[PDB]
Design a protein around this ligand. Structure first.
Ligand SMILES: N=C(NC(=O)c1nc(Cl)c(N)nc1N)Nc1ccccc1
Ligand code: NA
Ligand code: NA
Lengths: 213, 47, 202, 46, 214, 209, 213
């Protein structure tokens, strides 16, 4: 009963995990898992709200780690080059983490159908071998079919779409971080809010958001 | 695209499928073994 | 055959995965551009060349040409109009590549969930498998899912992707023609030499 | 590579393969018909 | 033969391939492709050596190839070299684009023929299993499905892709013939000797795909 | 069972030897073994040793070779050339080993299917018992299974592991080259530590932080 | 009947492969590609150690290899380095293009062979499934299908694709050979130290596939 379900999930998920652990390390797999969880349960801050907070701060002179780091390095580091270097490094690092989480889940989605095909080969082998015990072809055919189905479902409805959501979230985080870096530069040189808003207004429809308009 | 050997794999699977169609072409129905298969499949598939 | 649950499985799931891939506003954007590339024929490049010659002789049917004329009326310099036209062309190319990505993505996901749906139907049949005479037709309905994906993969979504690629190529070509005509008009040069220059590009 | 319908075709072919081994697992074959099938195949292959 | 022919299968394959091709090509471009395919498959392309022979024969004097007829007609007309060159280059580019488009149409046909072969065999397996009361009689029913698959395979591998490849070969031969005709017509217009052009004209006779031959 | 893996690996080796000689094939197996039974050295210990040598003025073989080369007396560009050549040689060996196991992965399923087709020929040519037709097929089909396993679960995983080990050695050796250059030029330890800390947080390592 | 089956399967596979390749490639191209495959399988490329030895021998001197003969003739003929370099680079490019095109012919064979094997199995299975009424039909039909598929697999994997691979390996070997020849002739024309050029040519020995240390 439970043996065929656990065997199918074992072949598929265990094969995927073995191949990916030969590809990535356990700590890096855990890091990618954390990134996916953060991208799937927190909504990326809207850029328009980011511009609103940027102009509010400019006129004055929370709830966002990056700009809080910018204003903390602003009160201390008076030069703009140290802040620019740190901010670009953080943006590049986050881009790297998202790209590599994408890589981990694309690897999972690439390998899982291969494990489904190996599973149906194993089921064919077992039930072509027995062919005489009814209690022996049932589990075998179930293993074949369910390994194929789990490969298909995990590949096309979990791992590939998690990778695509991570790519989308990487683009959104890149945009938000670039806008916050621009705002920190604007508060560095004390630019007027109107000109910086006009300089940022070309970002509300940039790339994907160009289809809606 | 796809593995270059996938063509030969569909070849092999189609050859085997048609071989089994031929083996069915002179096969005969059995009721007791049918019921045994159905019951074991029901037990494996969690029903 | 026809079957409501099977087409529902394919279409709903394809939309579901593509929605995790694309926002739903982008879904409308791609569908609308596909409709416009199917039902509204893009004007012949020769007709646009004829309109360019007529305008040069005097001193409009396309939005691009009309906006170029409006930009040249108030005497915008060469650099600003060149930048605006290049941005518009890259914007159109981006929109077309996004629509092609949407329909290509539908192409990859439709048969994947055809296989998902037929496997689900087959495990359901084997888990409720009682009558011999019905093992045949039941799996038949299961194949109905696969077939639909196949059709949608090969007769609807992939051809629309290729049609959008073709339309995009022609649109960038005609809009390059339009920027060249705009430059010639703001130059005020004679029609003959500018027509030769544009004919050199074809 | 190969076109994706090749993968769809291989998946469908293997799925029918599983289906037909399931069907045969509960079907009994003829004896003389199978012996003559085997003889024809043996003649054909050498 | 009767067991290898069915009208529903051929109708499915050809209708669907034509539909998918017409969503990416027009009826005019498809007709142009068919005409170029017939012209390439019925009228052979002249060996270049015969072109040099005719060129040197008519150079000192200063007809089967229509491009050379156009060239000599423009030469007799008295047009300046710039316009003659422009018109001839336009003709070569038009022929090259037409040949590439014919290759594209037949490649699209060869790409979408086996896809619709799989669609047709899906339809056939649907019918076979929907009328499956006993696996005793499934031979011919499965056979027609395999038959649609085979029609797709044959049309893709032996008709449309060979026609596309033959059109690529014919376009390479056309480029060679057209450019040799260009050089010869230019030499005739200048009025030079027949021997002098034969020194540089044979240097690039085996260009590209002919480089393996030597 | 045994004859099936024998056929798959024999056909794979036979076809692959037309691309890689027995010398190169054994070199690839030696590289794979050395990467599998040994552990790569963590860059933190390398950074510690570099900063220790920099403040002062080793088991690691590249470290010993570089330190000896720099204490022998040689221009900066000469040590740069030697270190770059060694790093590139190791990179080339690892890429070629990845290539050998990738080629084995590409060829294994095709040879599994060839073995299966040969088995089916040998079975249909000696059809005697219907009840034994099944397992006979199962044996022939068995070959195909091994191809799949050897394609996805042996040869391709070793190709991935060699790629990973290659990145690890390239990163370690780049840290070594930078540290040796800093040792020669007498740089301040803080800037070199900053560079090493920056380098340790790029690439596939970035997910761990 | 068995000999008829073998002839028909060989005919389907090999004749179809030949016909489809002949549309793509000129008959002269096919003949030359066969000649190059034979030459690669029949002659062992001269080891780069021997060429380095010969190069240093005429390096400290101030003959078998044909390209060595051409380079020596050009160096004696008093032709400047640009003309000699360009001409022999043209010759190297010609041999590279030849080997690439022969690889293409055998790749085309290895692509079309399983396609024709599938055409053969479709034909054989259609014939068998139409003719369940007799053995005399299904025997040869199944034999045709299986043997045409097996021949497709074997010719594609163990003949045509590995011949393409051997041709590409020989192309790399001959490119290394003639690049060594170029370096040696140029070093002779400069007249540099035999030891320095010896070491610098030995430097090329660690290129591509020969990392076996
Ligand atoms: N078995 C064949 N194999 C190939 O078609 C193939 N193989 C290779 Cl290796 C390639 N490069 N291109 C290919 N088209 N599949 C198939 C053909 C026609 C119909 C149905 C199935
Ligand atoms: Na399956
Ligand atoms: Na089933």
């Amino acid at each position: 009963g439970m043996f065929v379900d656990v065997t199918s999930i074992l072949i598929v998920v265990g094969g995927s995990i073995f191949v990916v652990l030969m590809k990535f390390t356990m700590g890096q797999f855990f890091g990618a898992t954390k990134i996916a969880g953060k991208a799937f349960m927190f909504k990326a801050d809207e850029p328009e709200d980011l511009i609103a907070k940027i102009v509010e701060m400019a006129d004055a002179a929370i709830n966002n780690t990056f700009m809080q780091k910018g204003i903390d390095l602003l009160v201390d580091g008076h030069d703009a080059d140290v802040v620019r270097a740190a901010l670009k490094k953080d943006i590049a690092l986050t881009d790297e983490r998202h790209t590599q989480g994408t890589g981990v889940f694309r690897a999972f989605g690439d390998v899982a159908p291969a494990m489904g095909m190996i599973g149906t080969l194993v089921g064919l082998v077992a039930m072509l071998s027995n062919m005489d015990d009814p209690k022996a072809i049932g589990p075998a055919m179930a293993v074949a079919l369910l390994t194929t189905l789990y490969g298909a479902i995990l590949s096309n409805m979990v791992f590939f779409p998690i990778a695509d959501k991570l790519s989308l979230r990487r683009d959104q985080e890149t945009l938000n971080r670039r806008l916050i870096m621009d705002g920190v530069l604007a508060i560095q040189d004390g630019q007027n809010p109107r000109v910086i808003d006009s300089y940022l207004k070309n970002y509300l429809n940039e790339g994907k958001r160009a289809l809606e308009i | 695209g796809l593995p270059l050997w996938m063509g030969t794999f569909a070849d092999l699977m189609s050859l085997l499928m048609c071989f089994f169609v031929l083996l069915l072409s002179f096969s005969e129905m059995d009721v007791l073994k049918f019921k045994q298969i159905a019951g074991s499949m029901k037990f494996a598939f969690g029903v």
